[PDB]
Design a protein around this ligand. Structure first.
Ligand SMILES: Cc1cc(C)nc(N)c1
Lengths: 1045, 239
């Protein structure tokens, strides 16, 4: 009666949903095929004398421990007289990367070697320079051995490797410029806000611009440390604060006024300011307020805690960076008088149902992001099985009208749906036009791409051999055909202009023709800047394009129009292109936040991207770089060749600054699993690691720590599923006590922030969470001298099996909306906690102490019997009592306003009790954002995801009933409206960041209409007065009443 | 007819999305209707809204603005159902069929990418076997040098006692080599079994993709046909 007795016969009884919460796998661990080598294993020791003696070993046993036992045991075997002293030998074996690593560091333990089969060969040290074969260091940090690059064919790869060393040396030379000061300046750069200018609400916490500080000092042996409690102007500098603190330290009843002054000078310069609790320093003359540490302390109602530290106890700690060069040290295109044609030959390895599909063909096009000619196909010949076409494809474009960065984009298709795809660059890295025969391995159609051809997709062949390999042939013109020099493209511009000045006025009915020569209309001159203001994502009309293209010379007045102009150039018309090249040559720089558009996938020309780098070189502070670092590392993908100006810029700034370095390492190492970019990023990470000085050692210790945790959780998730937490926890603690873990997981730097150190592992506070992703709550002793002043314990969550980078980006976007708002003078306090992806669905998330899901607030405050709308509000009163309560509601109201807007604008996941968090002091913040740009609409919602229940509203309006109608809530509303328009005026940036992210294979960002959601939500097609009303409309329906005027 | 006109930003792209080289339609007022031709968002000769669009369905836009050699498609089913509510059911049905179809596609795109990795892990492992073996093959050859020097030298001393425990060691060595090679062989056969399943993953993805686009495509026009009659943007959600 329920199911109309309708049987499903297919439904099998066993069979995913059953524990469906841990997607990404797999890997091999400490030995081939197995995660964790048996505690006691036997290994075969191939001697030089030919004898295989099979040592029973412990998994954690060090190589010297093994050798010393091997050579004791080889006395008992035959041919002993043939062996040297044990000291004249090194170990060697085959690894899981299938190279033959020599094991020089005989402290290393057997499980940590990444062996393949448990066997070790004995040999004598090959190469007098052992020193040189600590590339394995680099190989470990990168996670693929350097010897793998040496035997690469490609001259580009080889050219990049040797050419890029230019950069490495230029930054290392800056590091030893004022050594030891500059070396410290690399290692511990000043952690500063962007502007010294202070927002009013920060200032008003200052009683006429002053702060009480605490400068600590140590004497003998150490231990008794002594507070010196200054009260100095906010905008005074460190060298002044160090004087005042010495003044105070060294006033006395046995020292005259003068005698002190002369003591102060000799003492003043021998010290510097450290933050207590972490390795941060105040190394150059910034107004004190401007360091991040202070400005937080102000905002948090905290008294800063610095430390006088001698320069020789800091120049103690910096070892030498000491860089070494490695062991690895025509006829103009415009002459060609033909059109383009490309010969398709055969596609070999296509996997299709002959029963389901009729016919298969090759679609093809030329591109620049958008395309230089009518797109073609070929005839639907030898369909499905046996599929070949021997066809010259005929492209309506002359060969001189290909732009430097021209690209063929092709795909095999069915009838209409694509099977595979792959894109080639019509030129090579040495300017040379592609000719002859090319074998293109293809890429599988992604989730988001329904479109036939995929021209945003990555340039070059898939390395994965067993895929559709579609081979093809390019026309040959009896020489390497090279692209024009710039001296020649210049000349042809200076002609294209001189010729343009002698056409008839009858001809000015062309409309791409600025007949308003130097004088122009005021309506025109205004309608141009009206374009300028428009976001990147508003499509431009042929009329506007032409209108721009003609007036291009007035467009230098508005530098900011350049992106719109560049898209208005006919890149299929080498006259137009050679001219645009000549504008771009000396076009006024622009703001990075605008110049970063020019590095996205719609501007692939190298002249353009150059102008864009040049902008960064001027206007981009090292603060603002690490802010946008993700979007820059991402945008490398969109470069045509390995060696280019952006890679050199980033490589240099990273070797200039070890904080940028740090994240620049991980953001590359993060994406190393992805074969789109393994080669590119692999090579770049070689150069970084080769030139970064001692940080290569620090990275390796982090790198090794992450691997322990990867192997550990990979086990927990596979063999140990279907066991009690009790069982798993008893297995996790068993494991972490092993000395190889204890070595590998203790003294090292938080990859979330290398300022924090990690030191001892507190195992009783270490545990697995409930989640079936089996995340480890890991907890470290902050080993700082003044741990007690900052946090005695550091604790951060390692989560195997979850793609962190959506979260990563939303947090970064929030972090930006905050900085935007707070310089605007609207204090809304978001808490964008740390998140770092270190791999393929592997990452780190910062723990915010003293915070709970609304749900625990309601479980803890839940009455015995069958929760209360007030319980949140009652739990918050419970904490904050007095005039503390009044200001704690201000915090909840300030955060809760901003988090409403960010959430609405981004369109992050639906919020509820178990992903909304409230802190003791009363700040609210969101966690686990999931799909960010409204990725469940693929199955015009303009959704409101943060919908403020009674719970929140009560708390917003102290304790009232009919909260809807308080001033408390009138204030809150005004916060939301001011925040929303704030972000609407910076929407060019948020679009641009999201554009720059299409590079990563996040399914939420496959192409621009994904991003277009953030137009509607900000209502950019409207005017701000309707925007407001749209937002108010939007917010009103979700809440069921509240929002007008 | 000028309001209606059959063809008359964001949701224009999603109706131009996946259409031919020729398809079109027409869409701040204090700014300029916008012709949106797919191959191009679009003066002086103003002698002509329905007037202008008929003129260039026949004719190319080449003489208008030099590089626009493109004219054609001005874009029915739903079982022609003038039922409203029964068109409403079918939306949910196709939408469940489509959603059903995406999971099957999503599942397989995972298996595909594992099977790409799992395979490529296997390949490297074989390279590693082959190198492992080459070191044992060098070792069995390494011992044949110095062992057969330590047979003929002396010979009387130890005698079979010496050469036995050298010959045993040398047994162990080549028989270990036997195990390793048979280990490698067994990987390579498992490799082609993986590669077999891998081919079959693509195969069913390529046969799900076309149905996935049609199911989508129907569901769009079903949901168009509804929004045509009664605005009801809110009733659609449950479906
Ligand atoms: C979707 C689209 C279309 C065109 C002509 N240009 C873009 N940059 C993006």
């Amino acid at each position: 009666s329920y199911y109309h007795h309708h049987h499903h016969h297919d439904y099998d009884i066993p069979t995913q949903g059953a524990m469906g919460s841990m997607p990404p796998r797999p890997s091999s661990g400490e030995l081939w095929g197995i995660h964790l080598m048996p505690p006691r294993i036997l290994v075969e020791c191939l001697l030089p004398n030919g004898m295989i003696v099979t040592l029973e070993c412990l998994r954690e046993a060090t190589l010297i421990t093994i050798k010393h036992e091997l050579f004791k045991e080889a006395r008992k075997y035959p041919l002993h007289q043939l062996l040297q002293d044990e000291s004249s030998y090194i170990f060697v074996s085959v690894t899981q990367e299938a190279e033959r690593e020599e094991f020089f560091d005989e402290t290393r333990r057997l499980c940590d070697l990444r062996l393949f089969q448990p066997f070790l060969k004995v040999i004598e040290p090959v190469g007098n320079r052992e020193e040189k074969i600590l590339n394995r260091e680099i190989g470990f940090a990168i996670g693929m051995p350097v010897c793998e690059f040496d035997m690469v064919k490609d001259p580009e790869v080889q050219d990049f490797r040797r050419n890029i060393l230019n950069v490495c040396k230029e930054a290392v030379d800056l590091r030893d410029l004022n050594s030891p000061h500059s070396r410290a300046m690399y290692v511990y750069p000043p952690n500063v806000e962007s502007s010294p200018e202070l927002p009013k609400h920060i200032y008003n916490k200052l009683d006429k611009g002053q702060i009480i500080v605490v400068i600590w000092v140590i004497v003998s042996p150490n231990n008794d440390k002594q507070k010196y409690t200054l009260k100095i102007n906010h905008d005074c500098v460190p060298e002044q604060v160090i004087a005042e603190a010495i003044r105070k330290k060294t006033r006395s009843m046995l020292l005259s006024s003068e005698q002190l002054k002369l003591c102060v000078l000799e003492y003043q310069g021998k010290y510097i300011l450290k933050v207590c609790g972490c390795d941060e320093y105040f190394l150059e003359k910034y107004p004190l307020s401007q360091y991040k540490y202070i400005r937080s302390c102000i905002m948090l109602g905290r008294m800063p805690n610095l430390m006088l530290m001698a320069k020789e106890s800091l120049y103690s700690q910096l070892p030498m960076d000491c860089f070494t060069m490695p062991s690895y040290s025509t006829k103009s295109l415009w002459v060609i008088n033909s059109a383009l044609r490309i010969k398709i030959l055969c596609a070999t390895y296509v996997n299709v149902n002959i029963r389901d599909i009729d016919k298969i063909y090759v679609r093809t096009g030329i591109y620049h992001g958008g395309e230089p000619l009518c797109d073609n196909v070929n005839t639907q010949r030898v369909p499905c099985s046996n599929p070949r076409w021997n066809e010259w494809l005929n492209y309506d474009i002359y060969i001189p009208d290909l732009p430097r960065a021209a690209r063929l984009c092709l795909s095999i298709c069915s009838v209409h749906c694509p099977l595979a795809w792959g894109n080639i660059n019509l030129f090579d890295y040495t300017d040379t036009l592609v000719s002859g025969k090319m074998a293109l391995n293809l890429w599988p159609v992604p989730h988001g791409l329904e479109d036939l051809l995929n021209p945003i997709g990555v340039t070059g062949s898939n390395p994965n051999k067993e895929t559709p390999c579609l081979e093809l042939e390019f026309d040959w013109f009896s020489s390497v055909v090279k692209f024009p020099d710039m001296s020649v493209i210049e000349e042809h511009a200076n002609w294209s202009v001189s010729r343009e000045a002698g056409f008839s006025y009858s001809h000015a009915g062309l409309s791409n023709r600025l007949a308003r020569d130097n004088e122009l209309r005021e309506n025109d001159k205004e309608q141009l800047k009206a374009i300028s203001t428009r976001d990147p994502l508003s499509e431009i009309t042929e009329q506007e394009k032409d209108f721009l293209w003609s007036h291009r010379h007035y467009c230098v007045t508005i530098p900011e129009i350049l992106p719109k102009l560049l898209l208005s150039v006919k890149w299929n018309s080498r006259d137009e292109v050679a001219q645009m090249y000549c504008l771009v040559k000396d076009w006024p720089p622009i703001k990075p936040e605008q110049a970063m558009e020019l590095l996205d996938c719609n501007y692939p020309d190298p002249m353009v991207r150059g102008f864009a780098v040049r902008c960064l070189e001027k206007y981009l502070t090292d603060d603002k770089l690490s802010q946008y670092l993700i979007q820059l590392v991402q945008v490398l993908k969109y470069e045509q060749y390995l060696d280019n100006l952006l890679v050199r810029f980033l490589l240099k700034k990273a070797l200039t600054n070890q904080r940028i370095g740090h994240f620049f390492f991980w953001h590359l190492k993060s994406e190393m699993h992805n074969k789109t970019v393994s080669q590119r990023f692999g090579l770049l990470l070689e150069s970084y690691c080769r030139a970064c000085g001692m940080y290569l050692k620090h990275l390796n210790r982090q790198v090794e720590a992450m691997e322990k945790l990867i192997n550990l959780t990979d086990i927990l998730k596979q063999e140990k599923k279907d066991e009690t937490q009790k069982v798993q926890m008893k297995f996790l603690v068993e494991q972490m006590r092993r000395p190889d873990f204890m070595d590998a997981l203790q003294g090292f730097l938080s990859p979330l922030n290398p300022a924090h150190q990690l030191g001892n592992l507190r195992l009783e506070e270490c545990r697995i969470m409930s989640s079936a992703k089996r995340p480890l709550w890991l907890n470290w002793e902050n080993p700082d001298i003044m741990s007690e002043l900052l946090f005695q314990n550091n604790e951060i969550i390692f989560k195997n099996g979850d793609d962190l980078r959506q979260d990563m980006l939303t947090l970064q976007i929030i972090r930006i909306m905050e900085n935007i708002w707070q310089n605007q003078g609207l204090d809304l306090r978001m808490l964008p906690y740390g998140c770092l992806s270190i791999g393929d669905c592997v990452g780190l998330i910062e723990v915010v102490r003293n915070s709970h899901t609304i749900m625990q607030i309601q479980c803890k405050g839940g009455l015995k019997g069958a929760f209360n709308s007030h319980t949140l509000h009652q739990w918050l009163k419970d904490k904050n009592k007095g005039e503390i309560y009044d200001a704690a509601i201000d915090l909840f109201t300030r955060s809760c306003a901003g988090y409403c807007v960010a959430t609405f604008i981004l369109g992050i996941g639906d919020r509820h009790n178990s992903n909304i968090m409230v802190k003791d002091d009363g700040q609210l913040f969101h966690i686990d954002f999931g799909h960010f740009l409204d990725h469940k609409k693929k199955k015009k919602r303009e959704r409101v995801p943060f919908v403020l229940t009674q719970d929140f509203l009560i708390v917003i309006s102290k304790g009232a009933q009919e909260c809807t109608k308080t001033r408390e809530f009138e204030r809150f509303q005004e916060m939301c409206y001011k925040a929303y328009l704030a972000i609407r005026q910076h929407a060019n940036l948020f679009i641009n960041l999201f554009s720059m992210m299409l590079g990563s294979g996040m399914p939420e960002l496959q192409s621009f209409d994904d991003i277009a959601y953030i137009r509607k939500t900000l209502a950019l097609d409207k005017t701000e007065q309707e925007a407001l009303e749209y937002f108010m409309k939007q917010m009103n329906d979700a809440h069921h009443g509240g929002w007008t005027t | 007819s000028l309001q209606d006109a059959e063809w008359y930003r964001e949701e224009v792209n999603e109706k131009l999305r996946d259409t031919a080289d020729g398809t079109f339609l027409v869409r701040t007022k204090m700014h300029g209707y916008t012709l949106t031709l797919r191959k191009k968002l679009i003066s002086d000769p103003l002698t002509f809204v329905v007037e202008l669009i008929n003129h260039y369905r026949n004719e190319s836009l080449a003489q208008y603005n030099p590089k626009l050699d493109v004219k054609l498609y001005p874009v029915d089913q739903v079982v022609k159902e003038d039922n409203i509510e029964a068109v409403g059911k079918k939306l949910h049905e196709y939408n469940t069929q489509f959603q059903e179809k995406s999971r099957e596609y999503d599942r397989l795109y995972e298996e595909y990418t594992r099977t790409s990795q799992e395979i490529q892990m296997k390949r490297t492992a074989i390279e590693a076997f082959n190198e492992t073996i080459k070191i044992f093959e060098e070792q069995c050859q390494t011992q044949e040098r110095y062992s057969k020097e330590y047979i003929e030298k002396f010979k009387r001393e130890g005698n079979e006692k010496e050469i036995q425990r050298i010959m045993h060691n040398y047994d162990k060595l080549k028989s270990r080599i036997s195990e390793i090679i048979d280990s490698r062989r067994r990987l390579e056969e498992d490799l082609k079994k993986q590669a077999a399943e891998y081919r079959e993953i693509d195969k069913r993805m390529n046969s799900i993709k076309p149905d996935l686009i049609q199911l989508r495509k129907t569901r769009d026009q079903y949901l168009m046909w509804l929004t045509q009659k009664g605005v009801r943007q809110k009733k659609l959600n449950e479906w």
